[PDB]
Write a protein that binds this DNA or RNA. Structure first.
Ligand code: MG
Ligand code: MG
Length: 758
RNA sequence: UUACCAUCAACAUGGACUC
RNA sequence: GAUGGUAA
């Protein structure tokens, strides 16, 4: 998986190397003579006989881990506390793991959680926060405190502790006080305000530091009401709180906040009843206040808090390590199992891939250090330009003059790019209702029949009109369309740049080709998949598919597939692949020898399925092409990763440069894979992208796959410069977003020959 | 909707005795 | 989906 083709570079990570002292992780199968109910009794039974095992036992009910080898067979006797039964317990050795074996990993995490809790850091969700850090803002009685997202991973270099910084925001005023203020300002209605602010928001109880999301609020129950506890007694809420925590609810006329189930609860709602009725007096809302959210000045300071340069990130990690080292009990807790952290974050060596060359018609230039070429694209002719001679400009009356300059500005910049433009057909609208827009566009589209593009200027910021326009111009009446918001063309001194960007976007939509990059693999075909998940819900997830259909990767064939269940995804993707190969044969008169797939939108949990089931199913489709066996290469791209790279400058840890590749000591232990940071980072730490090769029948050397990925990162035409993921994946993401969000339908097959989805 | 990037929030994968 | 940053 490791290759070298570029200058070495010294990086550091947010990984602290863990060191194991013994090789003694012995697994034992523990069996009890009678069927023993409840794991607590079993754990106590094992506890009383600790003289045999010791006191470093990690026990979960069936498998017992020890750092010391017992006898081959161990038999012990004990007595039950309830039935006074004679329990003969057996301990038998199962296997001798190495200290880092991917199976003794999920209790090192338990030990670490115990350590962090021993540092007096509260557990909220899955993070460790420090209430003894009260940097207040006192604008809405707010409090921010910092914590860490920490875990113990293992990679092909060994064991590591992955640590990241985070911050939690909590109000000082209780829920009761804020609803009292709400009702204080108004009096007629306290439904809308209190219900909207509370329902859907997440609160925290400080007597146990536990978070609950509040499904509803009822003005119908009081502490005098009661609930059945442990099926033993119907006790009042006041008495239950007093007994468990000894706190008094002062004023009893309040609502109760209902969090009815936690619906999932692992497999399902075995504890279906749920029905949590939290008090409002002892709850505190969590989040950034919306009134604060709208206010810019308040948001500025909090943004300064959240955003950290790599130096501050490294300093926070150093502080955590020093805190762990100082507390002797935490160190003893870690070293009971033989583990011992290092004194600084692990320092690694990556390399910087060579810079690519970008080609335009009659010219070529080597990409600069910062990987951005915005000026050259707008200053020289593109590979292929489509002249517009018949296009319409729809504009409302109030924007009339504001439209004119745009057209004028589009007549001064089309020269350098080599694109030829004629004056449009101006269309002034009687009114701004969406019905008028759709009628006028439909009328010209139906009558003229020669329009090559429709440019619509929207006056007010409303999305329904945009959706209607796109539904008309991409589903019902296929013709490429551009939508311009009047604010963007409202100010001079930015009209030239936006005009150039818009013109390049229209040229791409018409079937143009801006720039290209050298490709060393002959007869290559490149594919990109991506998925879209509805934030609203409705649970229809759309998968977009984009495949190159020429030898320079300047033409694309685009398809989209709609399906909620997983039955039809694979065969619809097979249909898409067959259509793509047929189009490739038609254009080139030969089928591709090598096919590279860049799959995205796959979480870790399904990474095992996609490798084992879906890819052979797709490969089965080549059997309808008369003995045609290509050489496939399939990747899996993960954007959301929690690993940070800091380039080690002579003095402090700085942001790493673009084009950094890492394949050492941090990658997955079973796949071939590598981390690649390609885009130019300006705000924060450099988060790379993880590429996992789940199939390689072409026997491509690692250098070649990395080079091909970096080259494909240069071919996204909506942004001059390198992007995070390969261009086909971003194209698929945009296509899926447009089809699932705006159109609620699949675009007409007439438009799938160009990049209409820009 | 001229774009990209960032925190947040949805989302999806799941993951994990007390009112 | 909000707020902020950046751009011939
Ligand atoms: Mg993507
Ligand atoms: Mg667009």
């Amino acid at each position: 998986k490791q290759g070298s083709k570029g200058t070495p570079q010294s990086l550091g990570l947010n990984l602290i190397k863990i060191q194991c002292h013994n090789e003694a992780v012995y697994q034992y199968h523990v069996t009890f003579s009678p069927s023993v109910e409840c794991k607590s009794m079993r754990f106590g039974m094992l506890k009383d006989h600790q003289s045999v095992t010791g006191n470093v036992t990690a026990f979960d009910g069936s498998i017992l881990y020890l750092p010391v080898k017992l006898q081959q067979v161990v038999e012990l006797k004990s007595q039950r506390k309830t039935d006074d039964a004679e329990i003969s317990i057996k301990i038998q050795l199962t296997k001798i793991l190495e200290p880092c074996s991917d199976l003794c990993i999920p209790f090192y995490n338990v030990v670490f959680r115990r350590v962090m809790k021993l540092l007096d850091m509260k557990l909220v969700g899955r993070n460790f926060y420090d209430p003894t850090s009260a940097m207040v803002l006192q604008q809405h009685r707010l409090q921010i405190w910092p914590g860490y997202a920490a875990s113990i991973r293992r990679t092909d270099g060994g064991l590591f502790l992955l640590a990241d910084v985070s911050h939690k925001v909590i109000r000082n005023d209780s829920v009761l006080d804020v609803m009292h203020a709400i009702y204080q300002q108004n009096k007629e209605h306290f439904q809308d305000e209190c219900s909207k602010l509370l329902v859907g928001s997440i609160v925290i109880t400080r007597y146990n530091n536990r978070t609950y999301r509040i499904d509803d609020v009822d003005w119908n129950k009081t502490p005098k009401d009661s609930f059945v506890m442990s099926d033993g007694k119907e006790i009042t809420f006041l008495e239950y709180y007093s007994k468990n925590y000894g706190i008094t609810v002062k004023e009893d006329d309040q609502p109760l906040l209902i969090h009815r189930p936690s619906e999932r609860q692992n497999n399902h709602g075995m504890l279906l009843k749920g029905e949590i009725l939290l008090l409002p007096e002892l709850s505190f809302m969590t989040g950034i206040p919306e009134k604060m959210k709208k206010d810019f000045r308040a948001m500025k300071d909090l943004t300064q808090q959240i955003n950290l340069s790599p130096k501050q990130h490294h300093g926070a990690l150093e502080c955590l390590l020093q805190r762990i080292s100082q507390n002797e009990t935490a160190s003893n807790e870690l070293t009971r199992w033989g583990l011992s952290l290092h004194k600084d974050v692990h320092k690694i060596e990556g390399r910087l891939l060579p810079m690519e060359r970008i080609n335009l018609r009659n010219t070529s230039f080597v990409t600069s250090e910062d990987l951005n070429w915005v000026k050259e694209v707008t200053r020289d002719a593109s590979i292929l330009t489509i002249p517009m001679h018949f296009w319409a400009l729809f504009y409302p009356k109030r924007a009339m003059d504001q439209a004119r300059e745009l057209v004028n500005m589009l007549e001064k910049i089309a020269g350098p790019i080599g694109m030829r433009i004629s004056p449009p057909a101006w269309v002034e609208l009687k009114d701004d209702r969406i019905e008028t827009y759709i009628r006028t566009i439909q009328s010209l589209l139906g009558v003229e029949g020669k329009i090559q593009m429709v440019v619509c200027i929207i006056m007010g910021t409303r999305d329904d009109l945009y959706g209607a326009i796109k539904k008309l111009c991409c589903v019902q009446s296929p013709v490429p369309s551009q939508v311009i918001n009047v604010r963007t063309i409202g100010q001079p001194t930015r009209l030239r740049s936006v005009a150039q960007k818009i013109l390049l976007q229209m040229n791409c939509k018409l079937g143009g080709e801006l720039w290209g990059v050298d490709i060393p693999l002959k007869q290559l075909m490149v594919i990109g998949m991506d998925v879209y998940h509805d934030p609203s819900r409705g649970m229809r997830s759309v998968v977009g598919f984009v495949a190159s259909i020429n030898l320079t990767l300047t033409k694309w064939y685009s398809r989209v597939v709609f399906q909620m269940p997983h039955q039809e995804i694979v065969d619809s993707l097979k249909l898409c692949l067959v259509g793509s190969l047929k189009k490739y044969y038609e254009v080139n008169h030969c089928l591709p020898e090598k096919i590279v797939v860049y799959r995205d939108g796959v979480s870790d949990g399904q990474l095992k399925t996609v490798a084992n089931y879906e890819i052979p199913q797709l490969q089965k489709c080549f059997e309808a092409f008369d003995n045609y066996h290509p050489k496939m290469v399939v990747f899996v791209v993960q954007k959301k990763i929690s690993t940070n790279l800091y380039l080690a400058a002579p003095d402090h840890f700085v942001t790493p440069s673009p084009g950094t590749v890492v394949d050492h000591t941090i990658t997955s232990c079973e796949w071939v894979d590598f981390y690649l940071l390609a885009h130019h980072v300006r705000q924060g730490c450099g988060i790379p992208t993880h590429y996992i090769c789940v199939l390689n029948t072409a026997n491509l050397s690692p250098d070649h796959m990395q080079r091909l990925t970096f080259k494909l990162c240069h071919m996204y035409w909506n942004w001059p410069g390198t992007i995070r993921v390969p261009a086909p994946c971003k194209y698929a993401h945009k296509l899926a977003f447009l089809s699932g969000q705006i159109l609620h339908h699949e675009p007409a097959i007439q438009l799938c020959g160009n990049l209409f989805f820009l």
